[PDB]
Design an enzyme around this catalytic site. Sequence first.
Site, PDB file in Angstrom:
ATOM      1  CG  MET C  13      -1.868  -1.430   1.376  1.00 29.76           C
ATOM      2  SD  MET C  13      -2.694  -0.977  -0.182  1.00 29.76           S
ATOM      3  CE  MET C  13      -3.804   0.193  -0.028  1.00 29.76           C
ATOM      4  CB  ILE C  14       3.573   2.444   2.023  1.00 29.86           C
ATOM      5  CG1 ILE C  14       2.823   2.418   3.198  1.00 29.86           C
ATOM      6  CG2 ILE C  14       4.508   3.699   1.840  1.00 29.86           C
ATOM      7  CD1 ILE C  14       3.843   2.486   4.643  1.00 29.86           C
ATOM      8  CE1 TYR C  66      14.999 -10.600  -2.771  1.00 31.81           C
ATOM      9  CE2 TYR C  66      15.196  -8.360  -2.525  1.00 31.81           C
ATOM     10  CZ  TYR C  66      14.859  -9.489  -2.105  1.00 31.81           C
ATOM     11  OH  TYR C  66      14.100  -9.561  -0.773  1.00 31.81           O
ATOM     12  CG  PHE C  81       4.756  -9.586   7.337  1.00 21.04           C
ATOM     13  CD1 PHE C  81       5.850  -9.935   7.622  1.00 21.04           C
ATOM     14  CD2 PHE C  81       3.828 -10.154   6.527  1.00 21.04           C
ATOM     15  CE1 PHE C  81       6.284 -11.163   6.721  1.00 21.04           C
ATOM     16  CE2 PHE C  81       4.228 -11.212   5.890  1.00 21.04           C
ATOM     17  CZ  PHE C  81       5.416 -11.705   6.006  1.00 21.04           C
ATOM     18  CB  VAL C 124       8.914   2.528   5.319  1.00 25.18           C
ATOM     19  CG1 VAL C 124       7.916   2.677   5.904  1.00 25.18           C
ATOM     20  CG2 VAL C 124       9.606   3.721   4.598  1.00 25.18           C
ATOM     21  NE  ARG C 157      -0.018   9.479  11.322  1.00 31.11           N
ATOM     22  CZ  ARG C 157       0.328   8.272  11.245  1.00 31.11           C
ATOM     23  NH1 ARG C 157       1.173   7.893  12.188  1.00 31.11           N
ATOM     24  NH2 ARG C 157       0.099   7.353  10.190  1.00 31.11           N
ATOM     25  CG  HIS C 181       7.417   5.511  13.655  1.00 30.89           C
ATOM     26  ND1 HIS C 181       6.509   6.629  13.833  1.00 30.89           N
ATOM     27  CD2 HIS C 181       6.947   4.652  12.947  1.00 30.89           C
ATOM     28  CE1 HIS C 181       5.384   6.248  13.094  1.00 30.89           C
ATOM     29  NE2 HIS C 181       5.526   5.065  12.491  1.00 30.89           N
TER      30      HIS C 181
HETATM   31  N1  LIG Z   1       8.189   4.027   9.513  1.00 29.50           N
HETATM   32  C1  LIG Z   1       7.102   4.362   9.536  1.00 29.50           C
HETATM   33  O1  LIG Z   1       6.387   5.591  10.169  1.00 29.50           O
HETATM   34  C2  LIG Z   1       5.977   3.597   9.376  1.00 29.50           C
HETATM   35  C3  LIG Z   1       6.202   2.299   8.710  1.00 29.50           C
HETATM   36  N2  LIG Z   1       5.193   1.434   8.349  1.00 29.50           N
HETATM   37  C4  LIG Z   1       5.682  -0.188   7.944  1.00 29.50           C
HETATM   38  O2  LIG Z   1       5.745  -0.051   6.438  1.00 29.50           O
HETATM   39  C5  LIG Z   1       5.704  -1.379   6.032  1.00 29.50           C
HETATM   40  C6  LIG Z   1       4.951  -1.380   5.038  1.00 29.50           C
HETATM   41  O3  LIG Z   1       3.371  -0.870   4.916  1.00 29.50           O
HETATM   42  P1  LIG Z   1       2.498  -1.079   3.823  1.00 29.50           P
HETATM   43  O4  LIG Z   1       3.167  -0.966   2.476  1.00 29.50           O
HETATM   44  O5  LIG Z   1       1.197  -0.721   4.296  1.00 29.50           O
HETATM   45  O6  LIG Z   1       2.452  -2.647   3.694  1.00 29.50           O
HETATM   46  P2  LIG Z   1       1.906  -3.746   2.828  1.00 29.50           P
HETATM   47  O7  LIG Z   1       1.622  -5.282   3.732  1.00 29.50           O
HETATM   48  O8  LIG Z   1       0.999  -3.119   2.000  1.00 29.50           O
HETATM   49  O9  LIG Z   1       3.200  -3.765   1.894  1.00 29.50           O
HETATM   50  C7  LIG Z   1       4.403  -4.651   2.072  1.00 29.50           C
HETATM   51  C8  LIG Z   1       4.753  -5.509   1.048  1.00 29.50           C
HETATM   52  O10 LIG Z   1       6.211  -5.820   1.074  1.00 29.50           O
HETATM   53  C9  LIG Z   1       6.184  -7.132   0.657  1.00 29.50           C
HETATM   54  N3  LIG Z   1       7.312  -7.688   0.618  1.00 29.50           N
HETATM   55  C10 LIG Z   1       7.462  -8.812   1.670  1.00 29.50           C
HETATM   56  N4  LIG Z   1       8.969  -9.102   1.704  1.00 29.50           N
HETATM   57  C11 LIG Z   1       9.273  -8.405   0.532  1.00 29.50           C
HETATM   58  C12 LIG Z   1      10.743  -8.642   0.043  1.00 29.50           C
HETATM   59  N5  LIG Z   1      11.697  -9.530   0.626  1.00 29.50           N
HETATM   60  N6  LIG Z   1      11.112  -7.766  -1.142  1.00 29.50           N
HETATM   61  C13 LIG Z   1      10.126  -6.943  -1.393  1.00 29.50           C
HETATM   62  N7  LIG Z   1       8.704  -6.687  -0.827  1.00 29.50           N
HETATM   63  C14 LIG Z   1       8.631  -7.650   0.219  1.00 29.50           C
HETATM   64  C15 LIG Z   1       4.963  -7.649   0.295  1.00 29.50           C
HETATM   65  O11 LIG Z   1       4.513  -8.606  -0.368  1.00 29.50           O
HETATM   66  C16 LIG Z   1       4.135  -6.562   0.308  1.00 29.50           C
HETATM   67  O12 LIG Z   1       3.489  -6.093  -0.920  1.00 29.50           O
HETATM   68  C17 LIG Z   1       5.274  -2.160   7.342  1.00 29.50           C
HETATM   69  O13 LIG Z   1       6.335  -2.779   8.159  1.00 29.50           O
HETATM   70  C18 LIG Z   1       4.468  -1.079   8.302  1.00 29.50           C
HETATM   71  O14 LIG Z   1       4.247  -1.368   9.451  1.00 29.50           O
HETATM   72  C19 LIG Z   1       3.751   1.893   7.776  1.00 29.50           C
HETATM   73  C20 LIG Z   1       3.308   3.239   8.269  1.00 29.50           C
HETATM   74  C21 LIG Z   1       4.493   4.269   8.992  1.00 29.50           C
END
Ligand SMILES: NC(=O)C1=CN([C@@H]2O[C@H](COP(=O)(O)OP(=O)(O)OC[C@H]3O[C@@H](n4cnc5c(N)ncnc54)[C@H](O)[C@@H]3O)[C@@H](O)[C@H]2O)C=CC1
Lengths: 317, 317, 317, 317
Positions: C13-14, C66, C81, C124, C157, C181
């Site tokens: 999603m991000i 990769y 995740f 992230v 926020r 964070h």
């Molecule tokens: N640092 C920050 O302020 C925050 C960090 N997050 C962390 O961001 C991460 C991403 O969130 P979203 O996009 O929403 O998650 P998501 O689950 O939508 O996207 C994550 C994805 O990474 C994938 N993935 C898994 N293993 C991988 C690999 N070895 N190589 C490439 N892709 C791989 C997935 O298949 C997937 O599509 C999570 O850990 C969430 O908690 C989200 C909001 C802000």
Amino acid sequence: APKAKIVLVGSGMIGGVMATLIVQKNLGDVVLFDIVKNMPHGKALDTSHTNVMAYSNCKVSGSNTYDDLAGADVVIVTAGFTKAPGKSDKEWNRDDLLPLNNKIMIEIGGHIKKNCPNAFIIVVTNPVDVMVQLLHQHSGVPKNKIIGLGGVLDTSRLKYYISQKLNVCPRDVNAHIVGAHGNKMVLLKRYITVGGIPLQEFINNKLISDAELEAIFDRTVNTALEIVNLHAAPYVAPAAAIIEMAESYLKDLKKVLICSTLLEGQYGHSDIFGGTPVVLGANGVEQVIELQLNSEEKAKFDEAIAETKRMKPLAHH
Amino acid sequence: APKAKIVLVGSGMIGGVMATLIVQKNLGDVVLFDIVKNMPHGKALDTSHTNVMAYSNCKVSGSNTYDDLAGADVVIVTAGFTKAPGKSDKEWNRDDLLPLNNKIMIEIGGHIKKNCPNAFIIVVTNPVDVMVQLLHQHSGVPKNKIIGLGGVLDTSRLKYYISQKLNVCPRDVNAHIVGAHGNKMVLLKRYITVGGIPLQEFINNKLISDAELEAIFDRTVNTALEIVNLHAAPYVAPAAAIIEMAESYLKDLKKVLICSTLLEGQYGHSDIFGGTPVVLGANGVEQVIELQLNSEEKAKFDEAIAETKRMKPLAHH
Amino acid sequence: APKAKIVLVGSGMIGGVMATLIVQKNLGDVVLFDIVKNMPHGKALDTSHTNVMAYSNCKVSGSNTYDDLAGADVVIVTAGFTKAPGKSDKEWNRDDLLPLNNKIMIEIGGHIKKNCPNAFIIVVTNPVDVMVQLLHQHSGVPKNKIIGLGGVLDTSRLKYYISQKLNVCPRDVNAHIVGAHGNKMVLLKRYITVGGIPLQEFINNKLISDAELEAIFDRTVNTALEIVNLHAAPYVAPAAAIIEMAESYLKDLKKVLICSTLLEGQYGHSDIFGGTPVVLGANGVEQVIELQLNSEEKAKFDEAIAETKRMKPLAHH
Amino acid sequence: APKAKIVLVGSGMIGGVMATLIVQKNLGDVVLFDIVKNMPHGKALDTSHTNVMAYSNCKVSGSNTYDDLAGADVVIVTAGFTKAPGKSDKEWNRDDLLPLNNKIMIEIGGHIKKNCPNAFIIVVTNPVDVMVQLLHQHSGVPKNKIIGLGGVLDTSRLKYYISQKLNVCPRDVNAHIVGAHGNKMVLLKRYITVGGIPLQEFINNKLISDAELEAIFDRTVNTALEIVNLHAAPYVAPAAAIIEMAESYLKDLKKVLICSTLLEGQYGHSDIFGGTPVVLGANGVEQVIELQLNSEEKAKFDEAIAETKRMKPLAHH
Ligand SMILES: NC(=O)C1=CN([C@@H]2O[C@H](COP(=O)(O)OP(=O)(O)OC[C@H]3O[C@@H](n4cnc5c(N)ncnc54)[C@H](O)[C@@H]3O)[C@@H](O)[C@H]2O)C=CC1
Ligand SMILES: NC(=O)C1=CN([C@@H]2O[C@H](COP(=O)(O)OP(=O)(O)OC[C@H]3O[C@@H](n4cnc5c(N)ncnc54)[C@H](O)[C@@H]3O)[C@@H](O)[C@H]2O)C=CC1
Ligand SMILES: NC(=O)C1=CN([C@@H]2O[C@H](COP(=O)(O)OP(=O)(O)OC[C@H]3O[C@@H](n4cnc5c(N)ncnc54)[C@H](O)[C@@H]3O)[C@@H](O)[C@H]2O)C=CC1
Ligand SMILES: NC(=O)C1=CN([C@@H]2O[C@H](COP(=O)(O)OP(=O)(O)OC[C@H]3O[C@@H](n4cnc5c(N)ncnc54)[C@H](O)[C@@H]3O)[C@@H](O)[C@H]2O)C=CC1
């Protein structure tokens, strides 16, 4: 990595608006170079404060030193004169600027060759199709690295005037004006579209008549003169057109923009610069597009080129 | 004065990107309305924080209450289903969505009529040319106040694919796809230009062949299907196309954009919606532009309309 | 020269919104890399058509390989995740993601080291302050070349919520949240300004009370949880915050943005990453700014760091 | 709905850049009104062609007729003189412009009252804090509907100069200059932040010294003079500051911007205009923010106001 360095050789009216727009767009650091003492520093200073309002971070410095061309990524040459001496506004002719600007190109070209031979150059100084080639020859830059301003600006006028008549977004009118930037510029009615649709359909629909379009063509050709004669100077749109070109280069947008470029057989012409659509991207002039003109349009194109050619020997003098 | 209020009826994937882009563009306050409890508030909250990064100031609120349509200036309807039940991705057909979405339009239309009869409406829900007319009929809005998404999106695909082959700025390819948004969409090779130049010149120059273009046409028609079959959902470009339309309205840009609109004799058709270039400005659909199609192109246009028409009675059921 | 190449490792999603915003901003070519077969190509395709609406020219490609990291200028790592297994939404804790994501960082880091050791990296994946250091250690990149997302997002926020109460432009509230964070993020009331003015003056003027601010602080800390519990997922603002960081780097804006960075004595801490204002420009992390915290604020900062540190050994496991 | 109509009363250097930036931003239709025959039409024409490059659709018209103020939504008054007669550049003082511009405000005010009493007015003509009140009194507009340019511009200088020393994004420095736009402008060191952080921390860190800041303060106060003395005229940043104000109004951004506004007890002053942060939004001056100055800062504020007050009777003469 480091921002682009954009040296505006010439810090007059066009230079000033180009600096403004570069900061608005955050396109790169800007040097306003001019032969007039201190003026460019004053303009640069003023301009520099707009980083705050624009949320940008482009340095804007003035220069009275040619060697500040060093490291330039883009050089935009407006250096020269807009009006000839003793000549009134009613008699304003870009050709008359030739004696006044020729020597300025040569000198700048020598500085570009010494200081930034790998810079992308945009020549504006009139008569542009002549001045651009003179600069090309003195700067030594590759033909894909230098162009002259003309068609983006001439067509913005035509596009704009048609868009007002048809009440559509100005950018939705596309049009081509080629050969040269001057009174022989070739307006190609056949290549005008509105929202990608042949202008002829709007003519068929009586939304704009042939007569209106002929008046718009005339206005387009005479726009600079019209502005000069309204007690103004055309420099805002010239600046915006130049920046759109510089921007396509810098951001590798690959926009098709009609500029003065070295012809190498297109339209039957070689060894001269003339206005035609080109694609401007990371590698400069990436493509020179040759419109498949008919014989009537080619005749006009020849007339335009003949004028540039006529002045070629006078410039080199 | 007060910002525009833009109600996104439907807060699913397209709705989410539309909210994002509205804030990026500072276009107006946004309401993400959905029937799913709380989801729109969660999406709105997330989205609202981007005002900070975007330097904007658009409220973004979620809603599970139809009456939040009150005061809407623009209503964008994505409410409904993207896939039919039991149907696999390989069998994805917008027509199958008709039974699923028909009843949703009617209800929304009744709410629009009650709450914001003077709003400008953009219908997205598929099959869009059918759903848009159903909504038009139930919402009671003027024909200049409602359109359906289709051509901006279908043509962005065609434009984009050609621009990649010719290495020009995507926006410099202009093209028209009309009649309906679906497998009968009419791709008009004759109205494709690149930098305002007939695509045929690039074909003559062997820069792109007819065969490549036929493959690009096929790809364009099948893009949604291609995306669905790559384990994705087409929603980013749909959102951007919708926002470009909404933006032209809101800022009175008067862009020519191909949308589904009420035909009143154009192309020989009345009492149906079909995709054609329109001009979107302050007064909504300011002009419906009728391409002067040839008989072959008109035959295709008829085929597209015939499909919308075929489903007209099924929708109303 | 060539556009920046931005590889989004993680196309969820991000990743999707980051691709969208990159094209909106014309920031560079984008690779959506993911381990999920074909999904990134589908998202890339969709996204790529928006070049047309955006007037941009950024390639957007999907990747399941990769080695497409090769030549990357910026790598943004969201791979992993968002939720732990068996855990409900009410029990959502970034710490629980640690077992799930640790191994993913290591692998990506090895690929970055092999393929783009000179890339600027933004991590992230949660728990970000832990994951960023793990990636730093495995990728081998200089400490000025990698940061983690946290403060830009947490503060957007807080900034946003205060701006709504005080009715000012969101960006006109500035605020600092440091250390980590997560639920121990340190909200520094003392460093909140509104239009550059100490928030305390607005409190003195009864325009916002201490109690309201404490509720806003609580909301800020719990925002992710609040969004998850509204049946949504926080990803739009995360994406925008990441893009603002990536943008400052790419365009050498030198914005002060609070990110997770390697501490080397600031706040009394070394050999760990923690959130603090940094300046992001052409050379990456150009400056790490150490807020001159008081003892109470430093105690909170220590508590935040202690949490990251506690998980350091678990991550590396 | 219809775009905003923005009448630039005064079509000189600032007017020209304001027209440029309005089109760049697509903010509304523009009228360049001036007493100089035809010049504004020439500038408008030139400017109008930039709609094409900007992708905008703002009409730009020249006017030599006061009644073109009719329907104005925003009126920006730069009408007047920049320099006094017989006075050299070294002796440039905004106060000397008072005899020259007073009569011009009155007349314009009468035209605004007759033609667009509900317009939002921005007064620029120097000495601005005096001219703005004179115009307020003659135009009859509500106190929330008129402001003078000063602080946005004076602070952009201070912000910019500090940002260059500290190598941060210009906009990340926030600072306040209040009381009046002139040599008594009050620079409040205490309200300077960098990335929301008290400038004192950067001073404590020897990143910028008190001495450097005193030189920057001096430069800020003398900037206009410095530019005039570099053979330039300050008009680019003035224009950008005015447009940022006009933009916050037009788009209801609610930015906190320091402008000259009617004081009604703030800082102990009533019945005069003075520079202070205000919030500019849809309803004009939405909030007048009173900085809680200390006695030393208030003394300076009084000195600034005393100057405006001293000239109040001379203006009205
Ligand atoms: N640092 C920050 O302020 C925050 C960090 N997050 C962390 O961001 C991460 C991403 O969130 P979203 O996009 O929403 O998650 P998501 O689950 O939508 O996207 C994550 C994805 O990474 C994938 N993935 C898994 N293993 C991988 C690999 N070895 N190589 C490439 N892709 C791989 C997935 O298949 C997937 O599509 C999570 O850990 C969430 O908690 C989200 C909001 C802000
Ligand atoms: N190609 C095109 O479509 C058009 C070209 N023009 C040509 O653009 C040029 C510039 O117009 P403006 O900016 O309005 O003129 P301007 O007279 O405002 O600016 C030109 C300036 O160049 C200077 N200059 C002279 N010699 C120089 C040198 N050796 N190095 C650096 N600077 C030098 C001047 O001092 C001066 O400030 C003229 O020749 C005008 O005709 C203007 C409109 C469009
Ligand atoms: N016209 C065009 O070119 C295309 C149209 N589409 C049509 O767009 C629609 C939306 O696509 P997505 O956003 O991706 O779908 P989605 O399934 O992500 O979002 C649709 C949503 O509408 C909701 N909804 C259902 N009934 C509703 C009601 N009465 N009021 C408000 N919300 C309601 C859902 O709960 C849901 O969140 C579909 O019919 C899709 O086929 C998608 C791409 C382009
Ligand atoms: N408030 C602020 O921070 C500053 C204010 N200024 C004041 O801004 C004003 C404008 O500066 P510029 O544009 O550079 O001057 P300029 O001299 O370029 O433009 C002023 C113009 O107003 C005209 N004009 C005179 N009487 C008029 C009337 N009755 N109606 C309409 N137009 C009329 C002129 O003919 C002329 O074109 C001056 O008083 C300057 O000192 C400039 C910089 C910032």
